[PDB]
């Protein structure tokens, strides 16, 4: 009927302020700034509506970087102080992000170094960390839990009779695989051994678990698929065989199980049915490490390269060259690939650039980080830091904030 209508003035006028606020909540920062300057009533709607507070909260809800900063910097205490406080805070967060991104691109970081002080057989094969702790598996047959803040050792878990090669934990349990060919389940709070799975014929090289199921893989060339009704009730569902050498890594989600092997192959399996789906071929030597999420698989190989793959069609999307030795661990998030090599070096790769076939190869490696004196066996990272462990018997925390 009417040609034009001031929605943001009209809606509060009828007692529907929240609709006007909801409209503005969809604006990006710069458009929210624009809305403030449209007219006095628009400003009042954004201000009385606490739109800047709502904008920061949506980011914390939608961006782990913003969530992580809220927690680290302490302004997260104010979420969930007038509107103007959040308006003035928003550019400080932007600048903070910018400095973090610059530190990554330029390699500016602080460094914490844990000496694991292994008495006999040195080296840390695997690790996982959170804000409270680092859990680590060692060639001396133990699991050591380190306090993330003080770097002291809080618990040594004993029971394996060979090296602790792989591990993962959640809010209840730690699960470990070992050169002694067993999988063990530990209480994450008390360290008590809760279960031991005797099944594999050779070293358990990798495992993952999630949402009541686990996959394990072994030097014995097989993959085992497990159903975990509880820490003490774990049943073998299926054995996947088909690899012609040790299976060095396994990852999975609800769509697929993904395994990679000394036999130079990646294999894809249907999680629900455990039926073979396809082999991703292409590496010229064995695959040492891998990570799979959504449609992307990234693998690192004895051929010194990293390959990116689409899981559905099996295509290799990009070959990453630059490491001078075997690529031994690899992880990735939304923006970066982080890889560790047998020469102790860690490389940071631009994942967006790598998935864009226009980008040249020489622009893909952002940095090379050289602080280990032995093979890098495992790393894990996030927006703010890398935690890595090595044959040199150290754990490093690389902090870019």
């Amino acid at each position: 009927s009417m040609l034009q209508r001031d929605f943001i003035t009209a809606l509060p006028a009828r007692g529907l302020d929240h609709i006007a606020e909801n409209i503005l909540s969809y604006l990006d920062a710069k458009s929210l700034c624009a809305a403030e300057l449209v007219c006095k009533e628009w400003y009042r709607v954004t201000s009385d509506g606490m739109l800047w507070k709502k904008l920061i909260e949506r980011m914390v809800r939608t961006d782990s970087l913003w969530r992580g900063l809220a927690e680290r910097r302490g302004w997260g205490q104010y979420l969930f102080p007038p509107n103007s406080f959040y308006r003035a805070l928003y550019p400080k967060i932007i600048q903070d992000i910018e400095t973090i991104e610059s530190n990554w691109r330029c390699g500016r970081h602080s460094l914490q170094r844990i000496h694991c002080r292994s008495e006999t057989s040195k080296g840390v094969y695997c690790l996982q960390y959170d804000d409270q702790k680092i859990v680590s598996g060692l060639r001396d047959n133990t699991i050591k839990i380190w306090d993330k803040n003080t770097l002291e050792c809080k618990r040594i878990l004993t029971g394996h009779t060979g090296s602790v090669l792989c591990l993962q934990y959640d809010e209840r349990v730690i699960i470990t695989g070992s050169s002694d060919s067993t999988v063990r389940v530990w209480d994450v709070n008390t360290g008590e051994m809760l279960n031991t799975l005797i099944h594999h014929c050779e070293a358990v090289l990798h495992l993952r678990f999630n949402n009541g199921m686990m996959v394990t893989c072994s030097k014995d060339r097989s993959i085992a698929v497990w159903d975990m009704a509880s820490p003490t009730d774990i049943t073998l569902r299926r054995v996947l065989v088909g690899h012609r050498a040790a299976v060095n890594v396994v990852d999975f989600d609800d769509k697929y199980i993904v395994s990679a092997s000394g036999d130079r192959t990646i294999k894809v399996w249907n999680t629900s049915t455990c039926e073979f789906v396809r082999t991703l071929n292409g590496h010229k030597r064995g695959i040492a490490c891998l990570q799979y999420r959504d449609r992307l698989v990234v693998s690192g190989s004895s051929d010194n390269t990293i390959r990116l793959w689409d899981i559905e069609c099996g295509a290799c999307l990009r070959v990453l060259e630059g490491h001078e030795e075997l690529v031994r661990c690899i992880r990735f998030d939304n923006k970066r690939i982080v890889s560790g090599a047998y020469d102790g070096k860690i490389k940071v790769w631009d994942l967006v650039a790598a998935l864009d076939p226009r980008a040249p190869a020489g622009t893909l490696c952002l940095r090379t980080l050289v602080e280990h004196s032995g093979r890098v066996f495992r790393l894990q990272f996030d927006e703010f830091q890398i935690v890595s462990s090595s044959h040199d018997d150290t754990i490093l925390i690389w902090d870019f904030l």
Partner: peptide, 10 residues
């Protein structure tokens, strides 16, 4: 062989 975590196709 010193790395027990991975193995070639041997």
């Amino acid at each position: 062989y010193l790395d027990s975590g991975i193995h070639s196709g041997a």
